[PDB]
Structures are given as structure tokens and as C-alpha cells.
Design a protein around this nucleic acid. Structure first.
Ligand SMILES: [Zn+2]
Length: 254
DNA sequence: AGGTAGACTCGGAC
DNA sequence: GTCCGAGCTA
């Protein structure tokens, strides 16, 4: 799930778990648990705590309990569901939180790629994976000025810059390529080569692209290689940039 | 020094 | 066999 989906999850999941008290925690793929590194300590500390809230930071979900916060990343295929403890688990279910009312919060992930970290609430924001996370792309904290400062101080490509979680929180590959197409900037351009207007435009397209998705095939380049650009008809091309599949129109983007 | 490329994980798809 | 990709180590 990308950031917009994660926000949808935060919004829809919260009412389904708020005020519920954890009675048990079951872990079927320990590698998901990153802190405490010992999945036994992770499970034990959460028992007896009541879910008080659910927040989002980038693509991380932050479950707020009585004393602790649980920080979760779903990567590409992770998903949460609330269901009855009486029903069989779905395939690829790796972590289950059991509530005192007979319902369960279940985490599924065919790729087993997601992560979970638990800390005292007051520490969560100053430990991984949240520590050093950059500003929310839809917050005033992420401004053109902030982007410009990071761009001028690096040799990397502009795509690499946007992919950096310390620059902006949870801005996914699809949104990077779409934002760059919409801003008319080739992904392989050196970040420091971007003019003031280009940074202004890129920031604007970033906020609009991810903002529009948060509010909600309407894609210009991502996954469209070999197909005509929707704006100029030039075949969309795909190469590797910053170690990622990168889609662009060689005519629209400069 | 500290920014940077690299390595690393998973399994569905070729 | 090789490909893919989000966010500790030289
Ligand atoms: Zn085009």
C-alpha cells in the first residue's frame, strides 16, 4: 500500500479497534518483529493494553495504546483485518492481536516484507523507524524551501532525492514517477541541477499527486512503458534510475 | 567526517 | 535463474 492507501487504512481501522483491550498476541513470522527484537517481549508487553488511537507517519501506522505505541510498515503487500477469533485465519497471516471481546486484529503479508516496532509512547518518535522521518508531504513542514535545501546539497538524481524518507515521508515510487512526469522533469536529472521554478513545480505536483490520491489507472507513466504518452503520444520508456524501475516520457520530461 | 552505494529481505512472476 | 523494491553497513 502507498501513502494514500495507508491513510485509508488508518481511518477505517481505528473505529474497529479503539477501546479494545489486548488479551493475547500471536506471532507466526518473527522476522516481522523488529523491536523489541525478541518477539516474546513484543507480545508480552502489549497484553492488557487498550487501543486508544491510530495515527499515520509517512507509510507507517502508529497504534497508540495505554503505555506503548506500535509502529507498523506494510511494504508492498501487507494488510490488516479485524475479524472473529472463531473464524479460520486467511493465508499468509503473520501476526494476530487478540482482544478481550473475541475479535482480532490480523496482519497478512504474502511477501513477509512488513515491519513492527513497539516502544513507550514517549520514545516512539525518537527511535527507528520513525526517527529522522521527514515531514508529511501534505504538511506545511514539507515546503518548496525544504525541498530546495535538500536538492542543492546533494549529487544524487532528483528521483533518488524524492525516494529519501528523510526528505519527505512515505513518497512512493509510483508517486515519484507521476510527480516528475507532471512536473516535466526527467528522473535521472541531478537533483542539484533543478532550477528554483523546477523545485517549486515539483513540490506542487508532489502535493497534488499524493493529495488527489489521498482524497480518493489515471496514470501517465507508471507501468505504461511501450504505450503512448497520454499527453504527446511518444512511447513511454522504462529504465533503471536510483535502483528502481523508472518510467518517463522522453519528450514531456526534460 | 558523513554522505553515499551497496547489501538485504521475500515469493510471485517470468 | 533471474527479476523486483522500502527503508543497516562500508
Ligand atoms: Zn509525453
Amino acid at each position: 500500500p502507498e501513502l494514500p492507501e495507508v491513510e485509508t487504512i488508518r481511518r477505517t481501522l481505528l473505529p474497529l479497534i479503539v477501546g479494545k483491550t489486548i488479551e493475547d498476541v500471536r506471532i507466526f513470522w518473527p522476522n516481522i518483529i523488529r523491536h523489541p527484537r525478541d518477539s516474546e517481549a513484543f507480545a508480552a508487553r502489549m497484553i492488557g493494553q487498550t487501543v486508544r488511537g491510530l495515527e499515520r507517519r509517512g507509510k507507517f501506522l502508529k497504534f497508540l495504546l495505554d503505555r506503548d505505541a506500535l509502529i507498523s510498515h506494510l511494504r508492498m503487500e501487507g494488510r490488516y483485518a479485524v475479524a472473529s477469533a472463531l473464524e479460520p485465519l486467511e493465508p499468509h497471516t503473520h501476526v494476530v492481536f487478540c482482544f478481550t471481546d473475541g475479535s482480532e486484529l490480523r496482519y497478512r503479508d504474502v511477501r513477509k516484507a512488513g515491519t513492527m516496532h513497539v516502544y513507550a509512547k514517549e520514545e516512539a518518535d525518537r527511535r527507528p523507524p520513525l526517527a529522522e522521518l521527514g515531514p508529511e508531504p501534505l504538511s506545511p513542514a514539507f515546503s518548496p524551501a525544504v525541498l530546495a535545501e535538500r536538492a542543492v546539497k546533494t549529487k544524487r538524481s532528483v528521483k533518488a532525492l524524492l525516494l529519501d524518507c528523510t526528505v519527505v515521508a512515505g513518497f512512493g515510487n509510483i508517486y515519484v514517477d507521476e510527480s516528475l512526469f507532471r512536473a516535466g522533469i526527467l528522473p535521472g536529472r541531478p537533483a542539484a541541477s533543478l532550477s528554483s521554478k523546477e523545485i517549486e513545480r515539483l513540490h506542487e505536483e508532489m502535493v497534488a499527486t499524493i493529495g488527489e490520491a489521498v482524497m480518493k489507472h489515471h496514470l501517465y507513466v507508471y507501468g505504461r512503458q511501450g504505450n503512448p504518452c497520454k499527453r504527446c503520444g511518444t512511447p513511454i520508456e522504462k529504465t533503471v534510475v536510483a535502483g528502481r524501475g523508472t518510467h518517463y516520457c522522453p519528450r514531456c520530461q526534460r
